[PDB]
Amino acid sequence: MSKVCEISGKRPIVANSIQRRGKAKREGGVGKKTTGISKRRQYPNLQKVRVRVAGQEITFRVAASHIPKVYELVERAKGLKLEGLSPKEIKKELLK
Amino acid sequence: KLSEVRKQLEEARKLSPVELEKLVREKKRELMELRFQASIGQLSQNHKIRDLKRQIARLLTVLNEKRRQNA
Amino acid sequence: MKTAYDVILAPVLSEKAYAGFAEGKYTFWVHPKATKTEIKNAVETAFKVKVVKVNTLHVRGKKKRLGRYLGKRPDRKKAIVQVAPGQKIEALEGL
RNA sequence: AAAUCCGCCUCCCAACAAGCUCUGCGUGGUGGGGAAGCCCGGGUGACAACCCCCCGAAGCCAGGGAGCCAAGAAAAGCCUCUAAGCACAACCUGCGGGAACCCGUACCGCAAACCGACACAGGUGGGCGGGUGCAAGAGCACUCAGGCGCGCGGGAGA
RNA sequence: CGAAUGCCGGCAUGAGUAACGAUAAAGAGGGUGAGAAUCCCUCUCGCCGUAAGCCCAAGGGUUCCUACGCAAUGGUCGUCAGCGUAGGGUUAGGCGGGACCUAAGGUGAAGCCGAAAGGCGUAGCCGAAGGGCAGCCGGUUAAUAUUCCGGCCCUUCCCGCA
RNA sequence: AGCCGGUAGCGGGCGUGGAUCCCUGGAUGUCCGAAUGGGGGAACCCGGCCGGCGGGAACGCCGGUCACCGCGCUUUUUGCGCGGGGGGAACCUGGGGAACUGAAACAUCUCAGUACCCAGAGGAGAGGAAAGAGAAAUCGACUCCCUGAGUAGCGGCGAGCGAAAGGGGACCAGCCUAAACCGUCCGGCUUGUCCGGGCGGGGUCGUGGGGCCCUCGGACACCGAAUCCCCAGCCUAGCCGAAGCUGUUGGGAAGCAGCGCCAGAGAGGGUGAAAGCCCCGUAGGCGAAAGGUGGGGGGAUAGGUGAGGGUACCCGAGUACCCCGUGGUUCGUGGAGCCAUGGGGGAAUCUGGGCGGACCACCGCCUAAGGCUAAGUACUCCGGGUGACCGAUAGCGCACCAGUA
Ligand SMILES: [K+]
Ligand SMILES: [K+]
Ligand SMILES: [K+]
Ligand SMILES: [K+]
Ligand SMILES: [K+]
Ligand SMILES: [K+]
Ligand SMILES: [K+]
Ligand SMILES: [K+]
Ligand SMILES: [K+]
Ligand SMILES: [K+]
Ligand SMILES: [K+]
Ligand SMILES: [K+]
Ligand SMILES: [K+]
Ligand SMILES: [K+]
Ligand SMILES: [K+]
Ligand SMILES: [K+]
Ligand SMILES: [K+]
Ligand SMILES: [K+]
Ligand SMILES: [K+]
Ligand SMILES: [K+]
Ligand SMILES: [K+]
Ligand SMILES: [K+]
Ligand SMILES: [K+]
Ligand SMILES: [K+]
Ligand SMILES: [K+]
Ligand SMILES: [K+]
Ligand SMILES: [K+]
Ligand SMILES: [K+]
Ligand SMILES: [Mg+2]
Ligand SMILES: [Mg+2]
Ligand SMILES: [Mg+2]
Ligand SMILES: [Mg+2]
Ligand SMILES: [Mg+2]
Ligand SMILES: [Mg+2]
Ligand SMILES: [Mg+2]
Ligand SMILES: [Mg+2]
Ligand SMILES: [Mg+2]
Ligand SMILES: [Mg+2]
Ligand SMILES: [Mg+2]
Ligand SMILES: [Mg+2]
Ligand SMILES: [Mg+2]
Ligand SMILES: [Mg+2]
Ligand SMILES: [Mg+2]
Ligand SMILES: [Mg+2]
Ligand SMILES: [Mg+2]
Ligand SMILES: [Mg+2]
Ligand SMILES: [Mg+2]
Ligand SMILES: [Mg+2]
Ligand SMILES: [Mg+2]
Ligand SMILES: [Mg+2]
Ligand SMILES: [Mg+2]
Ligand SMILES: [Mg+2]
Ligand SMILES: [Mg+2]
Ligand SMILES: [Mg+2]
Ligand SMILES: [Mg+2]
Ligand SMILES: [Mg+2]
Ligand SMILES: [Mg+2]
Ligand SMILES: [Mg+2]
Ligand SMILES: [Mg+2]
Ligand SMILES: [Mg+2]
Ligand SMILES: [Mg+2]
Ligand SMILES: [Mg+2]
Ligand SMILES: [Mg+2]
Ligand SMILES: [Mg+2]
Ligand SMILES: [Mg+2]
Ligand SMILES: [Mg+2]
Ligand SMILES: [Mg+2]
Ligand SMILES: [Mg+2]
Ligand SMILES: [Mg+2]
Ligand SMILES: [Mg+2]
Ligand SMILES: [Mg+2]
Ligand SMILES: [Mg+2]
Ligand SMILES: [Mg+2]
Ligand SMILES: [Mg+2]
Ligand SMILES: [Mg+2]
Ligand SMILES: [Mg+2]
Ligand SMILES: [Mg+2]
Ligand SMILES: [Mg+2]
Ligand SMILES: [Mg+2]
Ligand SMILES: [Mg+2]
Ligand SMILES: [Mg+2]
Ligand SMILES: [Mg+2]
Ligand SMILES: [Mg+2]
Ligand SMILES: [Mg+2]
Ligand SMILES: [Mg+2]
Ligand SMILES: [Mg+2]
Ligand SMILES: [Mg+2]
Ligand SMILES: [Mg+2]
Ligand SMILES: [Mg+2]
Ligand SMILES: [Mg+2]
Ligand SMILES: [Mg+2]
Ligand SMILES: [Mg+2]
Ligand SMILES: [Mg+2]
Ligand SMILES: [Mg+2]
Ligand SMILES: [Mg+2]
Ligand SMILES: [Mg+2]
Ligand SMILES: [Mg+2]
Ligand SMILES: [Mg+2]
Ligand SMILES: [Mg+2]
Ligand SMILES: [Mg+2]
Ligand SMILES: [Mg+2]
Ligand SMILES: [Mg+2]
Ligand SMILES: [Mg+2]
Ligand SMILES: [Mg+2]
Ligand SMILES: [Mg+2]
Ligand SMILES: [Mg+2]
Ligand SMILES: [Mg+2]
Ligand SMILES: [Mg+2]
Ligand SMILES: [Mg+2]
Ligand SMILES: [Mg+2]
Ligand SMILES: [Mg+2]
Ligand SMILES: [Mg+2]
Ligand SMILES: [Mg+2]
Ligand SMILES: [Mg+2]
Ligand SMILES: [Mg+2]
Ligand SMILES: [Mg+2]
Ligand SMILES: [Mg+2]
Ligand SMILES: [Mg+2]
Ligand SMILES: [Mg+2]
Ligand SMILES: [Mg+2]
Ligand SMILES: [Mg+2]
Ligand SMILES: [Mg+2]
Ligand SMILES: [Mg+2]
Ligand SMILES: [Mg+2]
Ligand SMILES: [Mg+2]
Ligand SMILES: [Mg+2]
Ligand SMILES: [Mg+2]
Ligand SMILES: [Mg+2]
Ligand SMILES: [Mg+2]
Ligand SMILES: [Mg+2]
Ligand SMILES: [Mg+2]
Ligand SMILES: [Mg+2]
Ligand SMILES: [Mg+2]
Ligand SMILES: [Mg+2]
Ligand SMILES: [Mg+2]
Ligand SMILES: [Mg+2]
Ligand SMILES: [Mg+2]
Ligand SMILES: [Mg+2]
Ligand SMILES: [Mg+2]
Ligand SMILES: [Mg+2]
Ligand SMILES: [Mg+2]
Ligand SMILES: [Mg+2]
Ligand SMILES: [Mg+2]
Numbered sequence: 012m013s014k015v016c017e018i019s020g021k022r023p024i025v026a027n028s029i030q031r032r033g034k035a036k037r038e039g040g041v042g043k044k045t046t047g048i049s050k051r052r053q054y055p056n057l058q059k060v061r062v063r064v065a066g067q068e069i070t071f072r073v074a075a076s077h078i079p080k081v082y083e084l085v086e087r088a089k090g091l092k093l094e095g096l097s098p099k100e101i102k103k104e105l106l107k
Numbered sequence: 108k109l110s111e112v113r114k115q116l117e118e119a120r121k122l123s124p125v126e127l128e129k130l131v132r133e134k135k136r137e138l139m140e141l142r143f144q145a146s147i148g149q150l151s152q153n154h155k156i157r158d159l160k161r162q163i164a165r166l167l168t169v170l171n172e173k174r175r176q177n178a
Numbered sequence: 179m180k181t182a183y184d185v186i187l188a189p190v191l192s193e194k195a196y197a198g199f200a201e202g203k204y205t206f207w208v209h210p211k212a213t214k215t216e217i218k219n220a221v222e223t224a225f226k227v228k229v230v231k232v233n234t235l236h237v238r239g240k241k242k243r244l245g246r247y248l249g250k251r252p253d254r255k256k257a258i259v260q261v262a263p264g265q266k267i268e269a270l271e272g273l
Numbered sequence: 274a275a276a277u278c279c280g281c282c283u284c285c286c287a288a289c290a291a292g293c294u295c296u297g298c299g300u301g302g303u304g305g306g307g308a309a310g311c312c313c314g315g316g317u318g319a320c321a322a323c324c325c326c327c328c329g330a331a332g333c334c335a336g337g338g339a340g341c342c343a344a345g346a347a348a349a350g351c352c353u354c355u356a357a358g359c360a361c362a363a364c365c366u367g368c369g370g371g372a373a374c375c376c377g378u379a380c381c382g383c384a385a386a387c388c389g390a391c392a393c394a395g396g397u398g399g400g401c402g403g404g405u406g407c408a409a410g411a412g413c414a415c416u417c418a419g420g421c422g423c424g425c426g427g428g429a430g431a
Numbered sequence: 432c433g434a435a436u437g438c439c440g441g442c443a444u445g446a447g448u449a450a451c452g453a454u455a456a457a458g459a460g461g462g463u464g465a466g467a468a469u470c471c472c473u474c475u476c477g478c479c480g481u482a483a484g485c486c487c488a489a490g491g492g493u494u495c496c497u498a499c500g501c502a503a504u505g506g507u508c509g510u511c512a513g514c515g516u517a518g519g520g521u522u523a524g525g526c527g528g529g530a531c532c533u534a535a536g537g538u539g540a541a542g543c544c545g546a547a548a549g550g551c552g553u554a555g556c557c558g559a560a561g562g563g564c565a566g567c568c569g570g571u572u573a574a575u576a577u578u579c580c581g582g583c584c585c586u587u588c589c590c591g592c593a
Numbered sequence: 594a595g596c597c598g599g600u601a602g603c604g605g606g607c608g609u610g611g612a613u614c615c616c617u618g619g620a621u622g623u624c625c626g627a628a629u630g631g632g633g634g635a636a637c638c639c640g641g642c643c644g645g646c647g648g649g650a651a652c653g654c655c656g657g658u659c660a661c662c663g664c665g666c667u668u669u670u671u672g673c674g675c676g677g678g679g680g681g682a683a684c685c686u687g688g689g690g691a692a693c694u695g696a697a698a699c700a701u702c703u704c705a706g707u708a709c710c711c712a713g714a715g716g717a718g719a720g721g722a723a724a725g726a727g728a729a730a731u732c733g734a735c736u737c738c739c740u741g742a743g744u745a746g747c748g749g750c751g752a753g754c755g756a757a758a759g760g761g762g763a764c765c766a767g768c769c770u771a772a773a774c775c776g777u778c779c780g781g782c783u784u785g786u787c788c789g790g791g792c793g794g795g796g797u798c799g800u801g802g803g804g805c806c807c808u809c810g811g812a813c814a815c816c817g818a819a820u821c822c823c824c825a826g827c828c829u830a831g832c833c834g835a836a837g838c839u840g841u842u843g844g845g846a847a848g849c850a851g852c853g854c855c856a857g858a859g860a861g862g863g864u865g866a867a868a869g870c871c872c873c874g875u876a877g878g879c880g881a882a883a884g885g886u887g888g889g890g891g892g893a894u895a896g897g898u899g900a901g902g903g904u905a906c907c908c909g910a911g912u913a914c915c916c917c918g919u920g921g922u923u924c925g926u927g928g929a930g931c932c933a934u935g936g937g938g939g940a941a942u943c944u945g946g947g948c949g950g951a952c953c954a955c956c957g958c959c960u961a962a963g964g965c966u967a968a969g970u971a972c973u974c975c976g977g978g979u980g981a982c983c984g985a986u987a988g989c990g991c992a993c994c995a996g997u998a
Contacts, residue, residue, distance in 0.1 A: 014545070027919060079911080109608065109611095147191070151605090164621085168620055216653055218647090219646090219654085302583100350563055374529105375529070380496100382488090387489080391506100392452105398488075398489080401484105401487105416480080419484050420480090424511105425469085547689075547712060557632075589650050
């Protein structure tokens with residue numbers, strides 16, 4: 012899709028880069044201040060998982076967190092027919 | 108006119124499409140020459156161009172009526 | 179219903195059209211979207227006469243401001259058609 | 274992929290060519306045109322003649338040629354080669370008959386019709402652009418053809 | 432509401448003032464007409480002529496031709512007009528473009544990427560004033576002609592035969 | 594009882610055998626546009642296939658059909674089938690997300706999750722049956738209003754920002770599933786009491802519930818939809834609807850005068866000027882074959898309900914949980930928990946787990962990681978009503994052929 016996980020649906024979120032000058036008030040620290048707050052994207056740790064399923068090779072773009080979910084989907088094996096677009100089946104219709 | 112278009116209407120109903128198809132193919136010619144008599148200069152006290160197109164229209168729907176459920 | 183009596187609309191009535199009756203060159207107003215090949219057959223069945231050469235052209239209507247409301251006259255197409263020598267489109271021979 | 278074709282090596286003949294093709298020009302059956310002047314755009318001049326020289330292109334033959342370095346589009350049309358398929362097809366050549374659609378075509382177009390608010394001394398690409406003289410020439414001066422005197426005038430003469 | 436160089440509108444002042452848009456230039460006779468320096472005709476004069484002439488393209492879109500017209504438009508006048516009303520007028524197998532080709536570029540199955548919108552992208556396709564392709568001379572109309580006609584001359588398809 | 598639109602005229606026609614006109618449905622509907630056969634400089638250009646038409650093979654016309662995507666079927670889609678494209682005044686949720694400005698400068702902060710961009714939904718959308726609140730052995734889904742409250746707090750503790758519980762009200766209903774065990778169909782196979790995917794059963798709870806056994810006798814009596822069905826009712830045209838004449842002035846009466854009358858109607862508009870009784874209305878009553886509605890009345894359908902004992906089988910995963918980075922909440926790192934989440938590590942199934950504002954015990958409240966759910970609410974392109982709402986420089990930009998010139 013676009014920098015998203017095919018398995019977890021995890022997609023890049025928006026977070027703030029907060030620069031802080033000061034000693035922590037919990038350290039005799041008159042206070043923490045804030046010099047800047049700007050926008051940044053956090054990107055899911057995406058990786059290629061390339062598996063040979065029954066006929067041909069099948070390539071995923073999964074979050075590294077959900078990698079074994081591929082190999083547990085690799086378990087389900089029946090319907091040894093058409094093209095490398097088997098994931099259509101390996102996908103949600105497995106999990107649904 | 109009202110009285111006989113009432114007749115002329117139910118008259119053309121139940122009258123095979125091919126002759127409905129044929130009748131109008133004549134009436135459109137009747138209009139064709141009618142346009143000429145009017146165009147060539149007042150050879151028409153007109154009033155007929157209208158109720159002939161209205162005739163032609165009237166037919167084509169009954170042509171269409173038969174062609175709705177089962178021909 | 180698509181009939182020959184729908185292609186041919188009215189006779190073109192002008193001195194220039196009349197000096198066409200000398201040869202087999204009769205000229206009518208046709209429907210603007212009608213093609214030369216479907217005008218040939220349109221005449222051939224509307225006047226029981228043989229068609230030799232069809233010439234067409236478009237005519238844009240004129241912008242006419244009838245009392246400060248300005249519009250356009252409908253666009254016409256017309257055609258001059260060659261009748262096989264000898265043959266005559268009789269009904270058009272008046273004047 | 275396969276080709277009898279292309280490419281590569283080898284003998285052979287040919288040959289600073291011819292021939293085979295292809296353009297251009299000239300001639301060509303024949304068809305047009307055809308002044309001045311004269312009488313109201315039009316008659317007649319007329320049965321017009323239609324020929325000989327000379328200058329001569331930047332254009333044509335054209336993929337011509339020589340030099341040069343900065344090293345100078347693509348694809349189809351076209352020829353050929355074969356594969357599937359099919360060889361009673363299909364293609365080529367020649368003669369015949371029939372078929373050949375859509376759109377533009379008015380007029381302005383260095384300008385009063387385009388861009389400049391204007392009938393605006395501005396701006397707008399391509400071709401023809403005749404004659405005489407002046408070294409030449411698209412220069413300059415006059416002038417064919419054709420086109421115009423710039424849509425306020427009349428005087429006065431500080 | 433008198434003021435905001437207020438806002439919209441109407442009318443003054445300047446003032447019968449400056450200007451009337453190239454210093455290429457006019458004169459006269461005759462005619463039409465309510466009315467003429469300005470419209471038509473003739474003759475004489477001046478001006479452009481690698482042009483101020485002629486032919487295409489773009490752009491403009493009926494301004495072209497004819498009849499009738501002068502309120503307004505025209506820097507004056509107008510009987511004239513590019514103006515008002517109405518009628519007419521553009522004819523193509525061969526000219527241009529399309530049922531041909533590709534160029535930059537655009538678009539884009541395969542594919543890749545991007546929070547979304549979307550961005551890229553070999554092939555293919557679109558794309559022309561470049562490639563390809565068969566028409567030359569005259570006559571005719573108030574106005575169209577390599578277009579209608581005259582003569583000579585070619586191109587494609589389809590179907591036949593050899 | 595007149596009609597052939599604004600609109601007369603010429604030139605013709607129709608209507609008590611019910612025209613014009615208004616309501617409902619139906620038919621025709623060129624080209625463009627999501628535009629969808631293919632192109633394309635929207636409204637033009639060029640095709641394949643099946644049938645037709647012309648003399649009809651070339652040319653042309655006509656009817657039909659052919660975009661792409663997703664999904665379910667199936668023989669790997671050679672096919673079929675349903676669905677999706679796009680528009681919409683504002684309202685709605687999500688995904689992104691400013692600045693001027695305020696801070697009498699400015700950077701945290703503010704303006705603000707605003708303007709705006711994008712995606713989706715609909716007549717609403719969101720949310721919604723508790724891992725909830727929070728001190729009363731206490732409330733009980735969600736949305737909205739009113740209050741709580743400018744309180745609690747947040748804060749260069751600056752400017753500023755600002756809850757919730759509770760209470761009163763509107764409306765008011767909760768329901769499916771995954772998992773254990775049973776059946777099964779095909780599968781794969783290192784054939785098996787095995788694994789597994791598709792289906793059917795079962796079963797859905799926090800005083801814990803269910804499964805499989807054990808005993809009990811449990812019952813269809815009762816319950817009953819948000820799904821379908823009929824109906825009243827409503828919308829889309831209409832209809833009936835009391836009661837005055839006369840005389841004067843006056844161009845003209847409704848004024849003035851004489852004598853009357855109706856009133857479930859004395860709201861208003863019109864009529865040559867000022868009318869309850871002249872016309873159009875009004876109070877009061879009527880009216881649907883057809884299309885839409887039907888939230889109300891009725892009916893069916895799914896669906897739903899036992900007790901006790903034992904067994905410990907199951908009770909939603911890269912999730913809970915913890916740490917780093919952040920958002921949300923009144924919370925600006927603060928003693929900072931709670932709800933979200935990009936990164937790392939990474940469980941258990943009742944003696945299991947989250948929460949009661951760090952953390953520990955105690956005492957309590959709840960059942961996370963699957964899903965749907967009317968009504969009360971928002972808006973106003975549209976129709977109608979009402980006005981101490983404007984009256985042509987006003988009122989929408991437009992009272993007039995204006996998003997026009
Ligand atoms: K890998
Ligand atoms: K020759
Ligand atoms: K022309
Ligand atoms: K010219
Ligand atoms: K003055
Ligand atoms: K010259
Ligand atoms: K005038
Ligand atoms: K490209
Ligand atoms: K070209
Ligand atoms: K009736
Ligand atoms: K078609
Ligand atoms: K938003
Ligand atoms: K700021
Ligand atoms: K300030
Ligand atoms: K400042
Ligand atoms: K805020
Ligand atoms: K089930
Ligand atoms: K099993
Ligand atoms: K009342
Ligand atoms: K009244
Ligand atoms: K257990
Ligand atoms: K916090
Ligand atoms: K949690
Ligand atoms: K709590
Ligand atoms: K709780
Ligand atoms: K809902
Ligand atoms: K006014
Ligand atoms: K206005
Ligand atoms: Mg950081
Ligand atoms: Mg910042
Ligand atoms: Mg900021
Ligand atoms: Mg991990
Ligand atoms: Mg890891
Ligand atoms: Mg009728
Ligand atoms: Mg039709
Ligand atoms: Mg044409
Ligand atoms: Mg080879
Ligand atoms: Mg020659
Ligand atoms: Mg002679
Ligand atoms: Mg020589
Ligand atoms: Mg020489
Ligand atoms: Mg040259
Ligand atoms: Mg040259
Ligand atoms: Mg060469
Ligand atoms: Mg050369
Ligand atoms: Mg090609
Ligand atoms: Mg031939
Ligand atoms: Mg011309
Ligand atoms: Mg010039
Ligand atoms: Mg030039
Ligand atoms: Mg001119
Ligand atoms: Mg200017
Ligand atoms: Mg101009
Ligand atoms: Mg102009
Ligand atoms: Mg001028
Ligand atoms: Mg000029
Ligand atoms: Mg120039
Ligand atoms: Mg020369
Ligand atoms: Mg010289
Ligand atoms: Mg020259
Ligand atoms: Mg010269
Ligand atoms: Mg010169
Ligand atoms: Mg001259
Ligand atoms: Mg002048
Ligand atoms: Mg004032
Ligand atoms: Mg004033
Ligand atoms: Mg002033
Ligand atoms: Mg001053
Ligand atoms: Mg002065
Ligand atoms: Mg002076
Ligand atoms: Mg002066
Ligand atoms: Mg006179
Ligand atoms: Mg004069
Ligand atoms: Mg000169
Ligand atoms: Mg000129
Ligand atoms: Mg010309
Ligand atoms: Mg043009
Ligand atoms: Mg113009
Ligand atoms: Mg005009
Ligand atoms: Mg005239
Ligand atoms: Mg004038
Ligand atoms: Mg003229
Ligand atoms: Mg005119
Ligand atoms: Mg030709
Ligand atoms: Mg020819
Ligand atoms: Mg074709
Ligand atoms: Mg092309
Ligand atoms: Mg191409
Ligand atoms: Mg692109
Ligand atoms: Mg060319
Ligand atoms: Mg050509
Ligand atoms: Mg020739
Ligand atoms: Mg010629
Ligand atoms: Mg001309
Ligand atoms: Mg010819
Ligand atoms: Mg009449
Ligand atoms: Mg209807
Ligand atoms: Mg049509
Ligand atoms: Mg398209
Ligand atoms: Mg299309
Ligand atoms: Mg093309
Ligand atoms: Mg066919
Ligand atoms: Mg046939
Ligand atoms: Mg078709
Ligand atoms: Mg079709
Ligand atoms: Mg269709
Ligand atoms: Mg949408
Ligand atoms: Mg869209
Ligand atoms: Mg939609
Ligand atoms: Mg948001
Ligand atoms: Mg989104
Ligand atoms: Mg400030
Ligand atoms: Mg709802
Ligand atoms: Mg309090
Ligand atoms: Mg509040
Ligand atoms: Mg309740
Ligand atoms: Mg099941
Ligand atoms: Mg069940
Ligand atoms: Mg238990
Ligand atoms: Mg009544
Ligand atoms: Mg009454
Ligand atoms: Mg009187
Ligand atoms: Mg009275
Ligand atoms: Mg009084
Ligand atoms: Mg009243
Ligand atoms: Mg009164
Ligand atoms: Mg009522
Ligand atoms: Mg009904
Ligand atoms: Mg009900
Ligand atoms: Mg009910
Ligand atoms: Mg649970
Ligand atoms: Mg925050
Ligand atoms: Mg925080
Ligand atoms: Mg926690
Ligand atoms: Mg805690
Ligand atoms: Mg506590
Ligand atoms: Mg749940
Ligand atoms: Mg929901
Ligand atoms: Mg008022
Ligand atoms: Mg008033
Ligand atoms: Mg106004
Ligand atoms: Mg007024
Ligand atoms: Mg309108």
